[PDB]
Design a protein around this ligand. Structure first.
Ligand SMILES: CC1(C)CCC(C)(C)c2nc(C#Cc3ccc(C(=O)O)cc3)cnc21
Lengths: 136, 135
């Protein structure tokens, strides 16, 4: 059971389309595609408490949060937001994001276990990027 | 003479410079990595310069004569008019003037020192330094 373990991305869908929906410029988008191709995720779960390490070739980001408690993070394009995760059900976290400064697209992420795969989705207005992870 | 083939030996404050230029975190991470291993070809004939800079998925070919305006982009890709002048016999200073919008004052310099090529970028108070050696 559980979200915890080491994950390798098996597939990604609609990354470029999501970034365009976020108002990321063409040059950054074009380049950013290659670099994000093969991320490794380490997740620690203790009930509603999470530590998530996301490693690329270029960078590691580490965040902690609790399901049920407001916290702070960045959007996929690195803009500051307040976040709130709840369990949609036993195997799925939905996390709403609200920008701290100004206006921009409505963003969210979700994480889901299905068939012992981790399905990460990012939303930006009507667009949805889907990243599918398997245990390594 | 600046002419020849150059590889980067070291880079300092690139991330800090991009932050000064209002580049957000994801694009910063990307830009630094992509710029991590540039290959530079310079041809120099007196005041006339060609600078070819090759990164992962970008080549810029920059032509200018010392004393005449030319078009280029800022390090973060905003439209500018540029002007190169000799600060001294081994240093080009290049003033940049933004065409579209308002933003930080930007410049670059290139300098020969102990047969190394030293590229400097400014964005208001921040300074990025990249050091090239002949490859
Ligand atoms: C607009 C944004 C964020 C996104 C697009 C890319 C192309 C990733 C980008 N690249 C740079 C750079 C550079 C650079 C500096 C110096 C040298 C050198 O001559 O050593 C080469 C490349 C900046 N910003 C971006």
């Amino acid at each position: 059971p559980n979200f915890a373990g080491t994950w390798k991305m098996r597939s990604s869908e609609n990354f470029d389309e999501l970034l365009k929906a976020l108002g990321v410029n063409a040059m950054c988008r074009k380049v950013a595609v290659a670099a994000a191709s093969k991320p490794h995720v380490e997740i620690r779960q203790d009930g509603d408490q999470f530590y998530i390490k996301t490693s690329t070739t270029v960078r590691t980001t580490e965040i902690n949060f609790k399901v049920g408690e407001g916290f702070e993070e960045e959007t996929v394009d690195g803009r500051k937001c307040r976040s709130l995760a709840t369990w949609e059900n036993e195997n799925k976290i939905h996390c709403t994001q609200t920008l701290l400064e100004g206006d921009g697209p409505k963003t969210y992420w979700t994480r889901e276990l299905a068939n012992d795969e981790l399905i990460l989705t990012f939303g930006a207005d009507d667009v949805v990027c889907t990243r599918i992870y398997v245990r390594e």
